[PDB]
Ligand binder design. Structure first.
Ligand SMILES: *[C@@H]1O[C@H](CO)[C@@H](O)[C@H](O)[C@H]1NC(C)=O
Ligand code: NA
Lengths: 247, 24, 29
Protein backbone atom coordinates (compact mmCIF):
# COMPACT_ATOMS: atom_id res chain seq x y z
CA UNK A 1 0.00 0.00 0.00
CA UNK A 2 1.30 3.43 -1.09
CA UNK A 3 0.37 6.59 0.87
CA UNK A 4 -1.53 4.54 3.45
CA UNK A 5 -1.20 4.16 7.20
CA UNK A 6 -0.96 1.37 9.72
CA UNK A 7 -4.18 -0.52 10.15
CA UNK A 8 -5.57 -0.61 13.66
CA UNK A 9 -5.69 -3.92 15.50
CA UNK A 10 -8.77 -5.83 14.44
CA UNK A 11 -9.51 -3.30 11.66
CA UNK A 12 -9.56 -5.85 8.82
CA UNK A 13 -10.27 -9.20 10.48
CA UNK A 14 -11.06 -10.78 7.07
CA UNK A 15 -7.56 -10.04 5.74
CA UNK A 16 -5.70 -13.18 4.69
CA UNK A 17 -2.02 -13.49 3.89
CA UNK A 18 -1.07 -15.92 1.14
CA UNK A 19 2.44 -17.00 2.10
CA UNK A 20 4.87 -18.86 -0.18
CA UNK A 21 6.37 -21.83 1.69
CA UNK A 22 9.70 -21.70 -0.18
CA UNK A 23 11.20 -19.31 -0.63
CA UNK A 24 9.64 -17.75 2.46
CA UNK A 25 7.76 -14.66 1.24
CA UNK A 26 4.45 -12.86 0.98
CA UNK A 27 2.72 -13.96 -2.23
CA UNK A 28 -0.59 -12.04 -2.17
CA UNK A 29 -3.44 -10.83 -0.05
CA UNK A 30 -6.78 -12.61 0.18
CA UNK A 31 -9.93 -12.36 2.27
CA UNK A 32 -11.89 -14.63 4.57
CA UNK A 33 -15.53 -15.01 3.48
CA UNK A 34 -16.55 -18.08 5.54
CA UNK A 35 -15.02 -20.36 8.14
CA UNK A 36 -13.54 -22.50 5.31
CA UNK A 37 -13.46 -20.33 2.15
CA UNK A 38 -10.89 -17.69 1.20
CA UNK A 39 -11.30 -15.37 -1.79
CA UNK A 40 -8.34 -14.10 -3.83
CA UNK A 41 -7.26 -13.12 -7.34
CA UNK A 42 -6.67 -15.84 -9.90
CA UNK A 43 -3.45 -14.25 -11.08
CA UNK A 44 -1.93 -14.66 -7.60
CA UNK A 45 -2.07 -18.43 -8.28
CA UNK A 46 -1.87 -18.69 -12.06
CA UNK A 47 -0.03 -16.35 -14.43
CA UNK A 48 1.77 -18.27 -17.20
CA UNK A 49 3.35 -15.14 -18.78
CA UNK A 50 5.60 -14.93 -15.69
CA UNK A 51 5.84 -18.75 -15.17
CA UNK A 52 3.54 -18.54 -12.13
CA UNK A 53 1.62 -21.74 -11.35
CA UNK A 54 0.94 -22.47 -7.67
CA UNK A 55 -0.93 -25.50 -6.35
CA UNK A 56 -2.48 -26.22 -2.96
CA UNK A 57 0.74 -27.59 -1.42
CA UNK A 58 2.85 -24.57 -2.39
CA UNK A 59 0.96 -22.12 -0.21
CA UNK A 60 0.06 -21.38 3.38
CA UNK A 61 -2.73 -19.09 4.52
CA UNK A 62 -2.16 -16.93 7.62
CA UNK A 63 -5.25 -15.40 9.14
CA UNK A 64 -5.65 -12.87 11.96
CA UNK A 65 -2.30 -11.24 11.30
CA UNK A 66 -1.10 -7.70 11.83
CA UNK A 67 2.69 -7.77 11.87
CA UNK A 68 4.09 -8.60 8.44
CA UNK A 69 6.80 -10.90 9.88
CA UNK A 70 6.32 -11.67 13.58
CA UNK A 71 4.56 -14.88 14.56
CA UNK A 72 1.50 -13.66 16.49
CA UNK A 73 0.88 -16.49 18.92
CA UNK A 74 -2.72 -17.08 20.05
CA UNK A 75 -3.69 -14.37 17.53
CA UNK A 76 -2.91 -15.58 14.05
CA UNK A 77 -4.11 -18.90 12.68
CA UNK A 78 -2.28 -20.88 10.01
CA UNK A 79 -4.16 -23.03 7.55
CA UNK A 80 -3.58 -25.31 4.58
CA UNK A 81 -5.56 -25.42 1.36
CA UNK A 82 -7.88 -28.28 0.52
CA UNK A 83 -8.61 -27.18 -3.06
CA UNK A 84 -8.06 -24.15 -5.30
CA UNK A 85 -10.77 -23.05 -7.75
CA UNK A 86 -9.77 -20.63 -10.55
CA UNK A 87 -12.55 -19.12 -12.63
CA UNK A 88 -12.85 -21.21 -15.83
CA UNK A 89 -12.88 -18.08 -18.02
CA UNK A 90 -10.07 -16.23 -16.25
CA UNK A 91 -8.18 -14.47 -19.09
CA UNK A 92 -4.50 -14.57 -18.22
CA UNK A 93 -3.54 -14.15 -21.89
CA UNK A 94 -4.65 -10.52 -22.09
CA UNK A 95 -6.18 -8.24 -19.48
CA UNK A 96 -6.93 -10.43 -16.38
CA UNK A 97 -10.67 -10.58 -17.08
CA UNK A 98 -12.43 -12.50 -14.27
CA UNK A 99 -9.42 -12.30 -11.95
CA UNK A 100 -10.95 -14.40 -9.19
CA UNK A 101 -10.10 -17.55 -7.25
CA UNK A 102 -11.53 -19.42 -4.27
CA UNK A 103 -9.56 -21.56 -1.84
CA UNK A 104 -10.98 -24.16 0.54
CA UNK A 105 -9.26 -24.53 3.89
CA UNK A 106 -8.37 -28.05 4.99
CA UNK A 107 -10.07 -27.37 8.33
CA UNK A 108 -12.44 -24.52 9.17
CA UNK A 109 -10.96 -21.64 11.13
CA UNK A 110 -12.40 -20.59 14.49
CA UNK A 111 -13.44 -16.94 14.45
CA UNK A 112 -12.11 -14.50 17.05
CA UNK A 113 -11.53 -10.81 17.79
CA UNK A 114 -8.97 -10.86 14.94
CA UNK A 115 -10.57 -13.36 12.53
CA UNK A 116 -14.01 -12.68 11.07
CA UNK A 117 -15.52 -13.05 7.59
CA UNK A 118 -16.45 -10.15 5.30
CA UNK A 119 -19.86 -10.02 3.63
CA UNK A 120 -20.35 -10.42 -0.08
CA UNK A 121 -22.64 -7.84 -1.66
CA UNK A 122 -26.22 -8.38 -2.67
CA UNK A 123 -27.71 -6.63 -5.69
CA UNK A 124 -29.19 -3.90 -3.49
CA UNK A 125 -25.84 -3.33 -1.77
CA UNK A 126 -23.85 -3.32 -5.01
CA UNK A 127 -26.27 -0.80 -6.54
CA UNK A 128 -26.18 1.55 -3.56
CA UNK A 129 -22.39 1.53 -2.97
CA UNK A 130 -20.79 1.01 -6.43
CA UNK A 131 -21.09 4.67 -7.45
CA UNK A 132 -18.38 6.98 -8.74
CA UNK A 133 -16.64 8.90 -5.98
CA UNK A 134 -17.77 6.58 -3.17
CA UNK A 135 -14.71 5.42 -1.25
CA UNK A 136 -13.68 1.85 -0.55
CA UNK A 137 -10.86 0.55 1.62
CA UNK A 138 -7.81 -1.45 0.44
CA UNK A 139 -5.56 -3.36 2.86
CA UNK A 140 -2.32 -5.29 2.48
CA UNK A 141 1.31 -5.93 3.35
CA UNK A 142 2.51 -4.97 -0.13
CA UNK A 143 5.21 -2.50 -0.96
CA UNK A 144 5.08 1.12 0.22
CA UNK A 145 6.61 2.62 -2.96
CA UNK A 146 6.64 1.68 -6.63
CA UNK A 147 8.99 -1.27 -7.36
CA UNK A 148 10.57 -1.73 1.17
CA UNK A 149 7.77 -3.59 2.98
CA UNK A 150 5.76 -2.31 5.96
CA UNK A 151 6.18 -3.58 9.49
CA UNK A 152 2.40 -4.17 9.79
CA UNK A 153 -0.79 -4.29 7.70
CA UNK A 154 -1.42 -1.03 5.81
CA UNK A 155 -4.77 0.60 4.96
CA UNK A 156 -5.87 3.21 2.43
CA UNK A 157 -9.29 4.63 1.47
CA UNK A 158 -9.85 5.26 -2.30
CA UNK A 159 -12.75 6.60 -4.43
CA UNK A 160 -14.40 4.62 -7.19
CA UNK A 161 -13.74 6.30 -10.55
CA UNK A 162 -16.13 6.85 -13.49
CA UNK A 163 -15.82 4.07 -16.06
CA UNK A 164 -14.93 6.29 -19.07
CA UNK A 165 -12.20 7.91 -16.97
CA UNK A 166 -10.81 4.47 -16.03
CA UNK A 167 -10.79 3.29 -19.64
CA UNK A 168 -9.07 6.48 -20.81
CA UNK A 169 -6.21 6.15 -18.29
CA UNK A 170 -4.96 2.87 -19.79
CA UNK A 171 -4.28 1.12 -23.10
CA UNK A 172 -5.69 -2.14 -21.66
CA UNK A 173 -9.15 -3.37 -22.66
CA UNK A 174 -11.44 -2.94 -19.60
CA UNK A 175 -14.38 -5.34 -19.06
CA UNK A 176 -17.59 -5.15 -17.04
CA UNK A 177 -15.82 -7.50 -14.61
CA UNK A 178 -13.48 -4.67 -13.53
CA UNK A 179 -13.81 -1.31 -11.86
CA UNK A 180 -11.10 1.19 -11.03
CA UNK A 181 -10.47 3.34 -7.97
CA UNK A 182 -8.03 6.04 -6.92
CA UNK A 183 -7.71 9.79 -6.68
CA UNK A 184 -7.25 12.02 -9.70
CA UNK A 185 -4.16 14.24 -10.09
CA UNK A 186 -6.05 17.38 -8.99
CA UNK A 187 -7.67 15.80 -5.93
CA UNK A 188 -4.92 16.54 -3.39
CA UNK A 189 -5.04 13.10 -1.78
CA UNK A 190 -3.29 10.03 -3.15
CA UNK A 191 -2.92 6.31 -2.49
CA UNK A 192 -2.76 2.96 -4.29
CA UNK A 193 -2.25 -0.74 -3.90
CA UNK A 194 1.21 -2.02 -4.88
CA UNK A 195 3.20 -5.21 -5.39
CA UNK A 196 2.18 -7.60 -2.65
CA UNK A 197 -1.37 -6.27 -2.20
CA UNK A 198 -2.80 -8.25 -5.13
CA UNK A 199 -5.77 -10.46 -4.36
CA UNK A 200 -6.65 -8.55 -1.20
CA UNK A 201 -10.06 -6.99 -0.59
CA UNK A 202 -11.53 -3.66 -1.63
CA UNK A 203 -14.26 -3.23 0.96
CA UNK A 204 -17.03 -0.76 1.66
CA UNK A 205 -19.04 -0.15 4.83
CA UNK A 206 -22.81 -0.10 4.26
CA UNK A 207 -24.38 2.97 5.92
CA UNK A 208 -27.62 0.94 5.93
CA UNK A 209 -26.79 -2.09 8.08
CA UNK A 210 -23.29 -1.19 9.38
CA UNK A 211 -21.63 -4.23 7.69
CA UNK A 212 -18.47 -4.32 5.58
CA UNK A 213 -18.90 -5.73 2.06
CA UNK A 214 -16.11 -6.90 -0.23
CA UNK A 215 -16.86 -5.11 -3.45
CA UNK A 216 -13.54 -5.74 -5.24
CA UNK A 217 -10.35 -7.79 -5.40
CA UNK A 218 -6.99 -6.03 -5.88
CA UNK A 219 -6.27 -7.05 -9.49
CA UNK A 220 -3.80 -4.86 -11.38
CA UNK A 221 -2.39 -1.42 -12.02
CA UNK A 222 0.29 0.57 -13.84
CA UNK A 223 3.03 1.46 -11.43
CA UNK A 224 1.87 2.41 -7.95
CA UNK A 225 0.24 5.73 -7.07
CA UNK A 226 1.06 7.39 -10.40
CA UNK A 227 -0.79 10.55 -11.36
CA UNK A 228 -3.36 9.84 -14.06
CA UNK A 229 -3.31 6.07 -13.37
CA UNK A 230 -5.78 4.07 -11.33
CA UNK A 231 -5.94 0.69 -9.67
CA UNK A 232 -8.20 -1.94 -11.20
CA UNK A 233 -10.33 -4.24 -9.03
CA UNK A 234 -12.24 -7.43 -9.82
CA UNK A 235 -16.00 -6.60 -9.73
CA UNK A 236 -16.94 -9.20 -7.14
CA UNK A 237 -20.73 -8.90 -7.43
CA UNK A 238 -20.74 -9.57 -11.17
CA UNK A 239 -18.99 -12.93 -10.55
CA UNK A 240 -21.25 -14.02 -7.69
CA UNK A 241 -22.92 -16.74 -9.76
CA UNK A 242 -19.57 -18.52 -10.12
CA UNK A 243 -18.66 -17.98 -6.46
CA UNK A 244 -22.07 -19.57 -5.82
CA UNK A 245 -21.58 -22.90 -7.58
CA UNK A 246 -18.14 -23.41 -6.00
CA UNK A 247 -19.69 -23.43 -2.53
CA UNK B 1 -24.09 9.24 -8.15
CA UNK B 2 -22.98 7.61 -11.42
CA UNK B 3 -22.55 3.81 -11.49
CA UNK B 4 -18.96 2.62 -11.30
CA UNK B 5 -19.76 -0.92 -12.42
CA UNK B 6 -22.89 -2.64 -13.77
CA UNK B 7 -25.24 -4.65 -11.62
CA UNK B 8 -25.92 -7.53 -14.03
CA UNK B 9 -24.12 -10.93 -13.76
CA UNK B 10 -21.32 -12.28 -15.96
CA UNK B 11 -22.30 -14.26 -19.09
CA UNK B 12 -8.43 -8.15 -28.98
CA UNK B 13 -6.07 -6.11 -26.84
CA UNK B 14 -2.57 -5.69 -25.47
CA UNK B 15 -1.48 -8.10 -22.68
CA UNK B 16 -0.80 -6.68 -19.22
CA UNK B 17 2.73 -8.10 -19.12
CA UNK B 18 3.81 -5.89 -22.06
CA UNK B 19 3.06 -2.63 -20.22
CA UNK B 20 6.18 -1.09 -18.62
CA UNK B 21 5.86 -0.83 -14.85
CA UNK B 22 2.78 -3.05 -14.76
CA UNK B 23 1.79 -3.90 -11.21
CA UNK B 24 0.54 -7.44 -10.66
CA UNK C 1 -25.04 -14.32 9.01
CA UNK C 2 -22.63 -12.36 11.21
CA UNK C 3 -20.47 -11.24 8.28
CA UNK C 4 -18.79 -7.85 8.11
CA UNK C 5 -19.39 -6.81 11.74
CA UNK C 6 -15.99 -6.56 13.43
CA UNK C 7 -15.59 -7.81 17.02
CA UNK C 8 -13.40 -4.88 17.99
CA UNK C 9 -15.41 -2.12 16.27
CA UNK C 10 -19.04 -2.63 15.18
CA UNK C 11 -19.73 -5.20 17.91
CA UNK C 12 -18.49 -2.67 20.50
CA UNK C 13 -20.08 0.50 18.99
CA UNK C 14 -16.56 1.83 18.33
CA UNK C 15 -15.51 3.43 15.04
CA UNK C 16 -12.09 2.97 13.51
CA UNK C 17 -9.83 5.93 12.79
CA UNK C 18 -11.00 6.53 9.18
CA UNK C 19 -14.31 4.80 8.50
CA UNK C 20 -16.00 8.23 8.74
CA UNK C 21 -14.15 9.26 5.56
CA UNK C 22 -15.93 6.39 3.82
CA UNK C 23 -19.37 7.26 5.15
CA UNK C 24 -18.75 10.93 4.34
CA UNK C 25 -17.99 10.04 0.71
CA UNK C 26 -21.33 8.22 0.34
CA UNK C 27 -23.29 11.44 0.88
CA UNK C 28 -23.76 13.40 -2.33
CA UNK C 29 -24.10 17.06 -1.34
C1 LIG D 1 -0.22 -25.16 -14.42
O1 LIG D 1 -0.85 -26.27 -13.61
C2 LIG D 1 -0.12 -27.49 -13.41
C3 LIG D 1 0.53 -27.40 -12.05
O2 LIG D 1 1.38 -28.51 -11.80
C4 LIG D 1 0.87 -27.72 -14.54
O3 LIG D 1 1.15 -29.11 -14.65
C5 LIG D 1 0.25 -27.20 -15.83
O4 LIG D 1 1.04 -27.63 -16.93
C6 LIG D 1 0.21 -25.68 -15.80
N1 LIG D 1 -0.65 -25.15 -16.84
C7 LIG D 1 -0.58 -23.88 -17.26
C8 LIG D 1 -1.55 -23.48 -18.33
O5 LIG D 1 0.25 -23.09 -16.81
NA1 NA E 1 -3.01 7.52 -9.41
Amino acid sequence: IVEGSDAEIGMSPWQVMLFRKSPQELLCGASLISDRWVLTAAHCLLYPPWDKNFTENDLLVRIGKHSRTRYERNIEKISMLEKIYIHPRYNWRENLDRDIALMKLKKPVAFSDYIHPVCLPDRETAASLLQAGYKGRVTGWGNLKETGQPSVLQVVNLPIVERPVCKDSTRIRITDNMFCAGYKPDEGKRGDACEGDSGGPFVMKSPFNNRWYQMGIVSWGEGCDRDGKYGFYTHVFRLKKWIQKVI
Amino acid sequence: GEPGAPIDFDEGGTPLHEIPGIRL
Amino acid sequence: ADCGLRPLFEKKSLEDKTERELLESYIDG
